[PDB]
Nucleic acid binder design. Structure first.
Lengths: 181, 173
DNA sequence: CAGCTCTGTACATGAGCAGTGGA
DNA sequence: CCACTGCTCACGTACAGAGCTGT
């Protein structure tokens, strides 16, 4: 439906909630703007150039970053996904993760890790803070990290700059992980 | 792409630019809920009860109205449309109207009728104003009427007038 | 008056657009 | 041709609000 953009030996995999309608129409990841993703990617220095969506399949392999979603199926969204839907998708997400074994699995949007901790970990997770989360992806060495959804809808972070901290921090975490290798 | 709803013997056909992404996904016409099109319909008394998009199929039946777009293919917005595609599209639009022959063909927006005019008719209009345009659809008796783009109460008037117009046309017999 | 599960609500910037009216 | 008023949606997320348990 909207194909993942995942390969092996990836530093970073970015996990999106469900693909939006624009995303489906263009068949490319995070093509909004206002989807803060691509701006943050540049600003954080994860990318040294400005990259629209169309550059998405050039990110594994040059940059180490892959795309996938927690729910494959198109939705407006995100308020319209069944609770069942999510936890059903948690299942298949994991399988990919353990198949592909990226260093860090970044969850885009808070709502998805909340459910993942429930369903995968069985942990309810009081007062979920962004960033590095203690539990490793089962049977892998992949670390989970949480970000605010890079969607303009998210009024508690207005601008891409507001979100950029998390992108930097992530890049930092990657860098460290590289050092212990 | 999003199918039209056209029947023969139609009082009113609503013509839009081209179906938006949501419109496609939901598979109904003017889902909104920030198109105003359904409220405006009701307030005017073209509908007796607040309808929603899920009722679009009933409309040529129960309510005498149908729907089409100038361009058929779904678009995010108007940027993505090309001049040639409006020209191709607007070409197709006449043919449907020629076939179906509704009383009044209603254009949603000023934008779109301006296009249709200068391609279909060959006049370009200086100072377009809403309401009934002097010209009829080629080889039909079908009239053209322009409506603000439905995308609330402040424009209800145009609907009300449209219903009134509809009534006169029937009314003559 | 704290302690959690559950259900829905106004929230902030900004791109995009329709319509008027400009320099 | 842009520059303006004003008003949607945008891959959500932080709240106060209602219902119960308990030292």
């Amino acid at each position: 439906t909207l194909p993942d953009i995942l390969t092996f030996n990836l530093d970073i995999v970015i996990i999106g909630i469900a693909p939006g309608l624009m995303a489906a129409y263009k068949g490319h990841h995070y093509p909004g703007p206002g989807n803060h993703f691509w701006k943050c990617l540049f600003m954080s220095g994860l990318s040294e150039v400005q990259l629209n969506h169309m550059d998405d399949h050039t990110l594994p392999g040059k940059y180490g970053i892959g795309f996938t979603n927690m729910v494959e199926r198109t939705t407006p969204g995100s308020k319209d996904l069944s609770s069942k839907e999510f936890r059903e998708g948690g299942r298949i997400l994991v399988q990919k993760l353990q198949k592909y074994q990226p260093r860090i699995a970044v969850f885009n949007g808070k709502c998805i890790y909340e459910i993942f901790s429930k369903e995968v970990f069985g942990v309810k997770v009081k007062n979920l803070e962004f960033g590095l989360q203690p539990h490793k992806i089962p049977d892998t060495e992949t670390l989970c990290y949480v970000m605010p959804s890079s969607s303009a809808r998210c009024a508690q972070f207005p601008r891409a700059q507001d979100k950029v901290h998390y992108y930097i921090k992530l890049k930092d975490l990657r860098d460290q992980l590289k050092g212990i290798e």
